[PDB]
Amino acid sequence: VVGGTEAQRNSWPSQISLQYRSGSSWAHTCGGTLIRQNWVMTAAHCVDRELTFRVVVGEHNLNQNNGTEQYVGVQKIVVHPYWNTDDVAAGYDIALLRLAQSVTLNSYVQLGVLPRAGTILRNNSPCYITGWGLTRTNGQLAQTLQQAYLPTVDYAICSSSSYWGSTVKNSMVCAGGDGVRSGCQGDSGGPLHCLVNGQYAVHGVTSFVSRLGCNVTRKPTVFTRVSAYISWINNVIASN
């Protein structure tokens, strides 16, 4: 997250760190949202690599013991059937991970609330992106969970020539683009929390940014629109 602030350790309990085994250690690669005690929602591009993954819930500082972490392996990965690794702009950047064990819920580990199918946010809706991603374009990962206020940019505006044009699809949510704050490498797969009816719900799965950089004016961070996949999500969980 570029231009973020450190999140309080109990603000976003559904946020998880998706890590892969590298040598004798583990490396954070993406974010994710805990949606069931044994299911995590993330981006398809985060797991279309042949690596061994683990999920860490109740995480705050990637480099220090917080005394709240739970580590669990990934048992099954279900990527959306239409996902194409070399066509991120097409959409379908979403995947579900079934955990080897069911995590224990507490103040640091909670299920993320998903919006009702078809829900579209009004332009400039209040949302926060969270993650341990790079704090600057071509920079380095954050040690502590970061959050950044990223108001939504509706489809009509986001798909206009000055913004993303046809690159953005209606199956996506755009947020930010003020040139100062944005998601960045390492935040992918994580949540975009938006306040609706007094409750925060996860409306997006962090997907991509501009080739020009993470924080680029009129190039808001792009997320997979969760409300466009509610049926798919329920179908996968119910059959696995």
Next chain:
Amino acid sequence: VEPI
């Protein structure tokens, strides 16, 4: 685009 750049996946993040």
